[PDB]
Write a protein that binds this ligand. Structure first.
Ligand SMILES: Cc1ncc(COP(=O)(O)O)c(CNC(COP(=O)(O)O)Cc2c[nH]cn2)c1O
Ligand SMILES: Cc1ncc(COP(=O)(O)O)c(CN[C@@H](COP(=O)(O)O)Cc2c[nH]cn2)c1O
Lengths: 334, 329
């Protein structure tokens, strides 16, 4: 009884979001999952398959993932899935002795670390958003989203490479890979102490279905597979990811619109005089002085607009054109 | 090094007639499947959807049909498995009694949780043990893989101990009696249920928990925020809105179970008094190996355990061939 309250008080309280009319605070894709693809999924659905325990990493889903990665060195043994990239990170924290990340970073790193009671360390990035000096080695997992959350800034190659050389296991969280070009998947050829985490959540408009995947060494994937829940991804969720990848041209078009919308907003913000990051994610970040930031949030709240607030300022997710314009119009006049 | 305490993952090719995973024998209804996609909002697939959704809690509550539980007493997991997995991250030590669910050992090792396996007595009764606050005791009732039911007294004794009881009612629909009413006295209890067996929804991963508000609150802070997909929650909701179609299937399942139980006894086999959706046949290992091979020859798969085989109830035909097979054996 008493120790359970001790469990609480150690982790952040569970809360749910109350979405405003124009929600741009969770990096969700602006467009719904394509309706004809939902119908495709409905049609490929074998009602008899619902009653069975369905191989979470589906054999054909791995194939599609491989296909998508389009490398010449990967095999099914280098890939696995997660109930969202969230679970991959979560279980990864169960696997290593200590988790290491650098704020500003994906806020769930801290939450999940405290949730599972894992030992972790937060070393802040330089004022230049560069990876600080740190003492890590085999035993630690270093979580590096890249593009970074919520800055969306892209780290330099020697930066990851440095951590990589320390023998520490790097978990390159490529949650925003799709909205940026590069990917360190190829690095899997030189380093074994690395894992690339992806999701269907941002570019495939499937955040509600929870599908993440990991590309890494056979030894890691095997380890991961022994630690994760056996059936972590539903038959229907996998079906959504497979259909999704069968029509990637569709989402390539949406991603292009998102990026073209990101740069448009980034340009407009500079013109207005705001300090912003060189975000390669599906969002933009604005540096603001607390007091002027708070003033901006109150104004936006008055207009049913929700963005993500941060110590450094605000993170704005890219939405539909009329939402992006709205953000610009309210920022202009303020 | 990335050691793993040697315990791989894999699912060999399921034989044609698969009776080894306590899976419902019937497909999810075609029309409920239709209803699910009917209520499917495409715009909601792109957002992060409250896993324990509000309507899902209302439905569950309604299905539990009690006079005290409120929304605060219920939560959900990505399969009953996830609820077990997270609970093991919440307590100092996990205690369970073999023969018991094989995944308790697996998830504990996997989650690095301290655990103690104390075998049930020779009469399948909860053994005497030193447990109290800090400890969490997993008791499936009906038990897996025997299907036998533990007496209320048994559960209560562990409860008085002050240790937390994780009452695993994965097979409840086939038994008919829950100890969820115990939440009126003990706060150190959680009942766990699933949609995988009685609702032919094993593939969609939806489990749920009924416990004290303090426990629900701590559980909700340790689990993944969005552990149950939007569509999975829809599937559970429609299943509950048509709960009578599954009670019919379940009635059939139990008939079949009792029918096989009489025939096996008659044939001379020693069995447990299973109240789940399967039977348990005791077999002296060597001969068991014989059956397994034989069945392997007929494309038939059952589950093998140290004391025998657990055969899941399938369609009337599958059951018939099973009785016939055990007969000619
Ligand atoms: C007693 C018990 N508790 C929980 C579960 C989980 O059900 P879900 O996660 O689908 O909601 C189960 C399910 N049992 C099996 C078979 O068990 P065994 O043959 O390993 O002893 C199905 C299963 C689930 N995860 C792996 N296998 C049970 O029985
Ligand atoms: C860096 C990073 N990694 C993983 C994920 C999630 O992947 P999945 O959806 O497959 O689990 C995210 C997503 N970011 C979210 C917004 O973060 P914020 O609360 O700090 O603004 C969405 C989210 C998902 N769970 C909680 N929040 C990510 O950015």
């Amino acid at each position: 009884m008493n120790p359970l309250d001790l469990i609480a008080k150690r982790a952040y309280p569970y809360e749910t979001e109350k979405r405003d009319k124009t929600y741009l605070a969770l990096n969700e894709n602006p467009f719904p999952f394509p309706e004809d693809l939902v119908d495709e999924v409905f049609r490929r659905l074998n009602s008899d398959a619902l009653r069975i325990y369905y191989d979470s990493p589906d054999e054909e889903l791995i194939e599609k993932i491989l296909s998508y990665l389009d490398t010449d060195f990967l095999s099914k043994n280098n890939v696995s899935v997660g109930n969202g990239a969230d679970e991959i990170i979560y279980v990864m924290m169960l696997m290593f002795d200590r988790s290491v990340f650098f704020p500003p970073t994906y806020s769930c790193y801290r939450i999940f670390a405290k949730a599972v009671g894992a030992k972790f360390l937060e070393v802040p990035l330089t004022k230049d958003l560069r990876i600080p000096e740190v003492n890590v080695g085999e035993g630690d997992v270093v979580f590096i989203p890249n593009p970074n959350n919520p800055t969306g800034h892209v780290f330099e190659r020697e930066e990851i490479e440095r951590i990589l050389k320390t023998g520490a296991f790097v978990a390159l969280d490529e949650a925003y890979y799709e909205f940026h070009g590069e990917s360190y998947v190829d690095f899997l050829k030189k380093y074994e102490n690395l894992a690339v985490i992806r999701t269907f959540s941002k570019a495939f408009s499937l955040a509600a279905q929870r599908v993440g995947y990991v590309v890494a060494s056979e030894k890691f994937i095997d380890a991961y597979n022994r630690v994760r829940l056996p059936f972590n991804v539903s038959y229907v969720s996998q079906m959504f990811a497979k259909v999704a990848l069968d029509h990637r041209e569709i989402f390539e078009e949406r991603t292009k619109f998102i990026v073209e919308e990101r740069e448009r907003m980034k340009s407009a913000l500079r013109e207005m005089g705001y300090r912003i990051t060189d975000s390669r994610g599906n969002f933009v970040f604005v540096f603001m002085e607390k007091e002027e930031k708070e003033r901006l949030l109150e104004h936006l709240r008055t207009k049913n607009v929700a963005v993500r607030s941060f110590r450094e300022g605000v993170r704005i997710t890219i939405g539909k054109r009329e939402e992006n314009d709205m953000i610009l119009r309210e920022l202009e006049v303020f």
